[model samples]
Target: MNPKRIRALKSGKQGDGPVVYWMSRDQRAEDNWALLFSRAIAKEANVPVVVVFCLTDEFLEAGIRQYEFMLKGLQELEVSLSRKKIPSFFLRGDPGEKISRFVKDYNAGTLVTDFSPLRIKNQWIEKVISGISIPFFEVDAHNVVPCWEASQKHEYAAHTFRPKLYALLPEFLEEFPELEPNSVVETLSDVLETGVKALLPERALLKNKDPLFEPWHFEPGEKAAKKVMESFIADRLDSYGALRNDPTKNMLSNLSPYLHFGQISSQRVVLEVEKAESNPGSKKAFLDEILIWKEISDNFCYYNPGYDGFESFPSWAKESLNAHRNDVRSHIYTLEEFEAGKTHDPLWNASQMELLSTGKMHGYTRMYWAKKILEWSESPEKALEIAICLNDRYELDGRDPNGYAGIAWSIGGVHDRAWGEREVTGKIRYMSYEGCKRKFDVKLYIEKYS
Candidate 1:
């Protein structure tokens, strides 16, 4: 934890009623800094702590599929909290107003919540901070190293941010302290009975019969998240470096969706990776991508601020893309066609189709996948709009920091250096169909998706 963040607010001023941890970005019960912090405060203050998640229907580019996944994950989270004698409540409305209403109703003196960088989430936090008279403390639980602790300025690329992250790793990456239940069993049950009515009404779309289970919208919650993490450590850690990039291999850990929804903690993932057998070469390679690459991505968003759109690109990239604004495209498709996987290139079409069908695309394929859309669209702006719209709509991990950073890298060279001149792409690094062919079994990938 950063000293600045810890000293921002005073402790133990209001001694004991209830501590409300408004669970937003960090959702799970285990290995979570926010949840553990709340538990400790409640224990020392002799008050019960309850978690509340406010669900809003106004998220742009999100649809039924995304909601289904989040709700399913929350359902499991409810069960886990129950085990700890902590009741969890779900409220539906504008989060800003909902949080304020809860704080006023409960007469909460202090509010503890997770941090978020997105404009929408930050706006909601701002509203709550201003609306309520209570002291608000935001915990930086999303990243392994706190974003503010890593760097003060926006990083130009991964190389610029990597050293800062490595230098601070020893202090920030220590194992998580355990969180024990602080509420009495009978009192916790009564609280649950009283707050159950605040739960959001079930969505009609999710209830409707479909091949995907009506109740099984997201993957099972914390338990499933742990199981997936353990399986990766036991079975796949050795091969992660060599095969993570191949779409056909399914070698990469499919943990992004769980992390995106806060079903799992990044801290948990880091701790387990450290425990793996001493395959220094493999461990170093995998950790570099997980820690260094991910931290760099977050740092880019922190500094650039306009990372979700085309404006965050380097000056050279922006200039080159503008120069080719009028270039003819070989083929162009509407956003609808792109979402439905109706495209001219079989390989690119397969990648998009797989994302729609399975809620994920291999990371390497994702790089080439977004670039091809830039090549086929009439303008760089249009290409960026289409890619972001589709990604936010479909992937469980959509609309996250990683997704925004990845799209920026592919379409606008946000954290990437300038490259040699090329058609349509201008000076952007070219991702050719033949290049993917050389790297993976492109024919098999096409066959699988087609």
Candidate 2:
């Protein structure tokens, strides 16, 4: 494990107790640097290592569908950890308070948690660090290169960030060390028994009674995540460059949900894709898309505090949008109308329905979906609100940095340059129904959703 991936949140002496890994963003039993680091620290101290997950129903806009996918993935992860002789506890309530109390109750020597750039997660970490007296650390296990190690600033775009990333890739892209199984197990069954009883409801099961609710299209867990990655490499990697933008084609990796849940590591995906036999063109394109664009969202949300709002827009974008604030929308729709996929444009409606029914939308159409919301809303601010509201509520991978960054890019030119001036959109890039028709079979997409 690379020591550079670990950062101290609070420095203190290690106690004569177990080392605890407070699993959060990275939720797997394998390819996890945070868990590996926790075990290493425990081994040095001749102490056992334990894992804990805190559950709450208070996360923003996450519906029954999202929770269902996450809980199932975590259930599998618990089994994997138990096989390695590591005990995992599921605690219910506020994360910071629950984790702090757990650490104190077990007399934890050290705390290591996976990193997340989101504000809410950071707040929870801050509270834990403040409440506890022991050493606390966070590891960047989700990214290929640690997010902070990649850069110290918000990168302007892929062009500026790519060179810096490539420079560091050689050092940080090395293979992961094997997580050797531990032989020691400490007793916590009494605590675990009480905690498991209070776990969040399996809301997705009850939602089966809802007429409009859709079951998760993708299976959840580490094994399922690996299968999807292998299937993409074997069946679709060769044609990814040619057909990724076509909604009707299944050339895309279909791995965002796994990535979001940290069931699979992006570095693991990159490592496999790099070695797999595939067309050089498609391979290169897919690599760049995941490596540069996907990872940069961490840089975006990490540096820019206003990631989910219009305030995150580039200055030029703000000026351009303000200049055209009064431009009349051709067909303004309320959030309720947008939620129900009742817009005038069949293409936009279809995109919304795809999100509703599948809990995932094609990447190409996601751009058009947000852009059309901007085009048909009362104002850019309102447009951003509507777009994010629906996105977080419906998409399986919602409330992630990628979702926030993509929405900001679509509505406010966050990572994009000013495009040719348009009526309602001003200098922001415009994605139209006609533009989608030019690229893919729009009729087939609409008919499938309709």
Candidate 3:
């Protein structure tokens, strides 16, 4: 692992116990820098390494569907870790309290964790810091180029961030070093076994009463993520540049869910895509989205405290939207109606239905879906709230920086530039049914979802 990927958050006394990998954002046991770094630390100290994942009863807007996917993935990861003699344990409750208590009880040598730009995760880390006096290190296992190392500030847009990312790719994009089996003297299996039995008494399944949640969604875990990545490179990469925006065509990589959950490393994705033979345009476009656009979302959220709020909008965008606040005279739907995919626009309704039924909305359609929310709602603020609410509630890739940045771009013009003046949206970019018709088969999409 590159040393730059690891940052010392705190330098405290190293205890005599095992090094704890408090796995959070990056879940996989393979191709994970956080786990690799943890192993490195333990190997040097001749102490065993243990992995801990603290699960909250309810995580933000995550429902039963999200919980199920995460738990299933974690279950798979535990098996993988057990093979290498790394004991993995899960504790349910407030993660900060649970993880802090675990570290202290274990008398850990040091603590290593994966990075997440989200505020809630940071709060948990801060709390954990206060409770333990161990050397704390955070590895940016999610991004190809570490978020903090990529830029010192929140990048203004993709154009600004792209060059910086591209320049550092060579240094950071090397192959991942394989993690060796536990070589330390102490196995500590007995203690871990008791902890597992006591804390993980049940699977702790959550229920989503929403009728939209289907009996199934995407398969969860690194193994499934690898298969999806392989299939996309072989089948979809050639046509990606040409048809990625067309909802009717399955040209997209369909890897966002895996990416959002950090089931697979983005660096691994980039490496495999580069090795694959595809149209140059398609390869470049796919890389742009995976590398530049996706990474910049992390950059945005890490620096901007108001990333999900209306205040995160650019000054020009805020001024434009505020001027048009009272001009709306069109269809409006309640949160209940939107959640049920009840809308005046068939295209928008179809997109919502796609998200509702499958736990993912087509990439291009998401923009149209969010912009319509702004147009239909009474105010831009209300539209942003409803858009985020619906998105976080239903989408499998919900509660991510990409989702927040995309919603802000659609409704508040976060990274986007002003367009020609229009009703309700004003200088904010607009999308309509006519545009959807010109871009793809709207009726086919509407009919499929309907």
Candidate 4:
């Protein structure tokens, strides 16, 4: 493994003992670099490895459905770890303090964990590092190209970041080693219930539960993720470039929910896609999204702290939006109105309804949906706020870097350039019902999803 993917967060001295992988963002037992690294550490030290995950009721915008999906996956992961003689420990409270107690109680040697760029995640890391005296290392298991290693400073846009990642791809985009099974102390297996069993919450359905969820939503796990990837490659990948933009088309990989929870690795997805029997155009389009498009969001959120705000956009975008601040909106809607999908346009309503019924929305429709939010709202800032609030509140992939970057790109033009001048949107790009009609069967989409 390339050590460049791992960075020591705290260099403080500590006594040798058990190695603990403080699991958070990356939750899978397979195709997980952080877990693999921690197991390697334990193997070298001739000690057992413990994977600890902290859970709280207050995770940002995540509700019953998200937690149920996550906890169920963790339950599966814990069993997988057990067969390999690794113990899974779960703590529920202030993450840092609980992790601190775990480390102290176990006399841990090194604390290793995966990386996340969100503000709360960074705060949790700070609290963990401060509360514990052990040496800490962060692994960029989420990105194919480590976010920090890709660039030291905030990148201007996708065009700027693409070349950098392309240059590093050959070196970083290699296959992962098998996470070998190994033995650990016998006592660790005795308290398995306290780990996964204690971690799982009572399963329940989400509010406004879509009748299609049972049929449409894929099961959550490393195994299920791989299966979905296989089906996607076999059935839909060849037309990915051609049909991915059409909301009516069922060609999407539908892997965001898994990717967002880190139940599956992006590296694994990229490797599989590269080997798939697909045409060059389709392969390129799929790779561009799963790799560059996804990582751009990861990179943006990492370097730009205020990734979700209006102020973080390009100066031209900012100036343009300001110039049109007082421009009259053809229609203005309250947050409640937006949430209820009460917009005038059936296309926008369908997009919102998709997000509400399913935990995700089509990518092209998402951009159109957000731009319309900007066009209809009283102010650009308010549009940004409403877009983010709804996205994070409902989307299964909400509270993710991709969601933040997408909303920012749509409402504030974070990674976008000024477009033809418009009324409320100014130079920020505008999308309309006619635009949607020209692109695809907008009526079909509305009739199907509405």
The number of the candidate with the highest lDDT is: 2
| Tens digits of lDDT, candidate 4, 160-226 | 9889999999999998898887664233333333443443442223455433233247688778989
Number of the top TM-score candidate? 2
Give the 10-residue window scoring lowest on summed lDDT in candidate 3: 201-210
TM-score of each: 0.89, 0.94, 0.93, 0.93
Worst 10 residues of 2 by lDDT: 198-207
- Candidate 3 error regions (>4 Å): 184-211, 215-217
lDDT of each: 0.76, 0.86, 0.84, 0.83
Alpha-carbon RMSD to native, per candidate? 4.6, 3.3, 4.5, 3.7
lDDT of 3 by residue, 1-450 (tens): 579989898999878789999888888988999999999988888999999887665554455567667767877888899899998887767877887888878788889899888988888888888888888999999999999989999777788888999999889999989999897412234433443454442222224543555735479888999999999998888999999999998778888888888898888999999998789999999999989889889988999998988888899999998888889558888887777677777788888778877888899999998998888888888888999888887788889989988998898888789899998888988887897899888889989987
Question: At residue 55, what lDDT does model 4 achieve?
Answer: 74
Each candidate's clash count: 0, 0, 0, 0
Error of 3 at 271 (Å): 0.2
Which lDDT value does model 1 have at 447? Answer: 93
Scored by lDDT, model 1 comes in at: 0.76
Minimum summed lDDT over a 10-residue window in model 4 is located at: 184-193
Off by over 4 Å in 4: 185-216
Winner of 2 and 4 under lDDT:
2
Order of candidate numbers by lDDT, starting with the best = 2, 3, 4, 1
Q: Give the C-alpha miss distance for residue 57 in model 2, angstroms.
A: 3.2
